Amino acid sequence: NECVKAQSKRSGFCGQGTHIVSFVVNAPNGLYFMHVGYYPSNHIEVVSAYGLCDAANPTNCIAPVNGYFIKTEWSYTGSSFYAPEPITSLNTKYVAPQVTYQNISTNLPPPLLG
Amino acid sequence: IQRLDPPEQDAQIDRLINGRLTTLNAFVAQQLVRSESAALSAQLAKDKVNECVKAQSKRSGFCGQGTHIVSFVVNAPNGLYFMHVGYYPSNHIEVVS
Amino acid sequence: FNHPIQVDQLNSSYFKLSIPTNFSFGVTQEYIQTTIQKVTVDCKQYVCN
Amino acid sequence: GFQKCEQLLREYGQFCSKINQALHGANLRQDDSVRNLFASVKSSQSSP
Amino acid sequence: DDCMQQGPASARDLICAQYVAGYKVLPPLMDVNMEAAYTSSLLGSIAGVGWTAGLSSFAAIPFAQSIFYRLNGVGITQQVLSENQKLIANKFNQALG
Amino acid sequence: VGWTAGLSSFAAIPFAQSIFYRLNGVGITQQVLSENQKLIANKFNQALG
Amino acid sequence: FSVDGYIRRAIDCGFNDLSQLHCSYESFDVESGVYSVSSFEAKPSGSVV
Numbered sequence: 447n448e449c450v451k452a453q454s455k456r457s458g459f460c461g462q463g464t465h466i467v468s469f470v471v472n473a474p475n476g477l478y479f480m481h482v483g484y485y486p487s488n489h490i491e492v493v494s495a496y497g498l499c500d501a502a503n504p505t506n507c508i509a510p511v512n513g514y515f516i517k518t519e520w521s522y523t524g525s526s527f528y529a530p531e532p533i534t535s536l537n538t539k540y541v542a543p544q545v546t547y548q549n550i551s552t553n554l555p556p557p558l559l560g
Numbered sequence: 561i562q563r564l565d566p567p568e569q570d571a572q573i574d575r576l577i578n579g580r581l582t583t584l585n586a587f588v589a590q591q592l593v594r595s596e597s598a599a600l601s602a603q604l605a606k607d608k609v610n611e612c613v614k615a616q617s618k619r620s621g622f623c624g625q626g627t628h629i630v631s632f633v634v635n636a637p638n639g640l641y642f643m644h645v646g647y648y649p650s651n652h653i654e655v656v657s
Numbered sequence: 658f659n660h661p662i663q664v665d666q667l668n669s670s671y672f673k674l675s676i677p678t679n680f681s682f683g684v685t686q687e688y689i690q691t692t693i694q695k696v697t698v699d700c701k702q703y704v705c706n
Numbered sequence: 707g708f709q710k711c712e713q714l715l716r717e718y719g720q721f722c723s724k725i726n727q728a729l730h731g732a733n734l735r736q737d738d739s740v741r742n743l744f745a746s747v748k749s750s751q752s753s754p
Numbered sequence: 755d756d757c758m759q760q761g762p763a764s765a766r767d768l769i770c771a772q773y774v775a776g777y778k779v780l781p782p783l784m785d786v787n788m789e790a791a792y793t794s795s796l797l798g799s800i801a802g803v804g805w806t807a808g809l810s811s812f813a814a815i816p817f818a819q820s821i822f823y824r825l826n827g828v829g830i831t832q833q834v835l836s837e838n839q840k841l842i843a844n845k846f847n848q849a850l851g
Numbered sequence: 852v853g854w855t856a857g858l859s860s861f862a863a864i865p866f867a868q869s870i871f872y873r874l875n876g877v878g879i880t881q882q883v884l885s886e887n888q889k890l891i892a893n894k895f896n897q898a899l900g
Numbered sequence: 901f902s903v904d905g906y907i908r909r910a911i912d913c914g915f916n917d918l919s920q921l922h923c924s925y926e927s928f929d930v931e932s933g934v935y936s937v938s939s940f941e942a943k944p945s946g947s948v949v
């Protein structure tokens with residue numbers, strides 16, 4: 447029910463790595479599970495923000511959704527695979543301002559260009 | 561052996577054998593019960609590390625009591641010792657919602 | 658002891674992200690026993706033949 | 707170590723082989739349990 | 755050798771009984787320093803593992819920052835957490851101390 | 852079955868389409884999945900093969 | 901055995917397999933199911949010396 451009929455979000459319940467899909471066949475005294483997971487490699491280190499705020503409009507802040515804001519100025523990458531793309535309203539959420547958010551004053555992404 | 565001849569010596573040794581064979585069978589049966597139990601328990605420990613320690617849990621009562629925030633693990637003599645830090649509310653008031 | 662990738666914390670408002678640049682799929686195989694062989698015994702015959 | 711006893715013990719079949727094999731399996735079970743448990747506690751990435 | 759040069763520690767010493775009774779206690783699969791290494795690396799992974807989607811990336815963020823995200827995630831607002839960061843750290847410290 | 856809310860409806864969709872939703876759901880963006888659909892299928896196939 | 905001690909009903913436990921079942925549970929009423937009972941023995945048809 448957790449593995450095969452659903453994608454699991456429980457680390458280590460199904461297989462190792464991030465669970466994607468599982469299959470089941472019969473075995474001599476039971477079931478044989480075939481768990482296909484996602485295994486990352488070649489990790490790199492990048493610098494990330496906790497969130498970004500409009501420096502001129504400090505109460506207007508965003509945080510990434512299922513990914514990170516990375517320096518490259520700021521761009522978005524999904525959490526499982528480094529692949530920078532523009533910060534847009536489809537990969538951000540508006541949040542309350544925090545002391546750890548960056549104050550950006552130049553190349554403001556579209557969710558902050560208000 | 562020192563006191564008895566074979567026809568009686570045999571019977572006496574045999575009593576000791578039966579008692580010792582019984583003891584060893586009981587011992588083994590328990591090591592199998594205890595090792596089966598420990599193995600199940602080990603899988604519970606596995607789940608707690610993944611659910612509790614490597615993640616914040618949203619499952620009431622799985623980790624500790626109250627709302628789970630963070631857990632830590634140290635080793636213990638025959639296993640793991642979980643340290644579950646939860647959020648415990650107090651001084652509740654009633655408001656209209 | 659196989660050490661994990663060490664990722665340093667920063668003295669700043671930023672943080673280090675250790676993020677994959679590559680990936681693979683792999684299969685964790687698992688066997689779960691659901692049954693045992695069912696056996697009955699003709700105890701009277703077993704013991705006394 | 708008494709030979710008379712060992713001679714009588716043999717009439718109970720391979721009793722000791724069963725004791726040893728049962729415990730050997732039971733002991734392997736913990737090494738496998740431990741190996742699996744730690745493989746899962748193990749982090750991929752970690753801070754110092 | 756300890757059981758020969760010193761002898762049993764007390765009545766019913768089950769460790770020295772091994773060489774007498776015919777049983778042996780076997781060593782565990784991992785030594786202490788290896789088990790410590792596993793839980794130590796686990797400790798250092800907590801803040802950056804239970805942070806976002808996927809199990810593939812690691813956010814090397816402060817423990818404290820992790821706690822505040824964990825508290826926010828259970829219903830405590832950011833205005834509250836911001837006003838009370840020292841109060842929260844003190845309560846946490848009392849819980850563990 | 853592992854597609855949306857509830858256990859009552861069935862989406863008869865391609866396996867491949869299911870995989871891409873599953874990958875998107877773990878943090879791989881759609882731009883990446885779109886550029887790499889053949890690469891992803893090949894890696895998956897290697898894992899099972 | 902009735903309250904007054906007389907035997908009014910009995911099972912010959914070697915008559916058939918159904919009778920063996922009743923005897924093994926020491927009851928005239930057993931639950932429905934499939935049960936193993938004593939095997940049907942092969943018997944000697946002669947002897948060799």
Ligand SMILES: *[C@@H]1O[C@H](CO)[C@@H](O[C@@H]2O[C@H](CO)[C@@H](O[C@@H]3O[C@H](CO)[C@@H](O)[C@H](O[C@H]4O[C@H](CO)[C@@H](O)[C@H](O)[C@@H]4O)[C@@H]3O)[C@H](O)[C@H]2NC(C)=O)[C@H](O)[C@H]1NC(C)=O
Nearest residue numbers: 499501504542543544545546547548549550670836837838
């Ligand atoms: C991006 O811009 C934001 C917004 O300006 C900036 O975060 C702000 O930083 C200031 C300090 O530089 C915080 O102001 C104070 O900081 C001190 C530090 O000790 C606190 O003690 C103060 O708290 C007292 O006063 C508050 C006033 O209301 C009380 O509510 C509180 O209970 C205490 O009495 C106070 O926090 C300011 O709060 C933050 N802003 C936010 C939203 O948290 C941010 O740092 C800039 N980004 C970067 C990377 O620099």
Ligand SMILES: *[C@@H]1O[C@H](CO)[C@@H](O)[C@H](O)[C@H]1NC(C)=O
Nearest residue numbers: 546666667668669670671816
């Ligand atoms: C750097 O770390 C020290 C550790 O005590 C801390 O006091 C100091 O404020 C930190 N500096 C920054 C920029 O965070």
Ligand SMILES: *[C@@H]1O[C@H](CO)[C@@H](O)[C@H](O)[C@H]1NC(C)=O
Nearest residue numbers: 486487488677678679680681
């Ligand atoms: C990912 O790893 C495989 C392993 O052989 C390699 O062939 C491939 O080129 C790698 N891709 C990247 C982007 O490094």
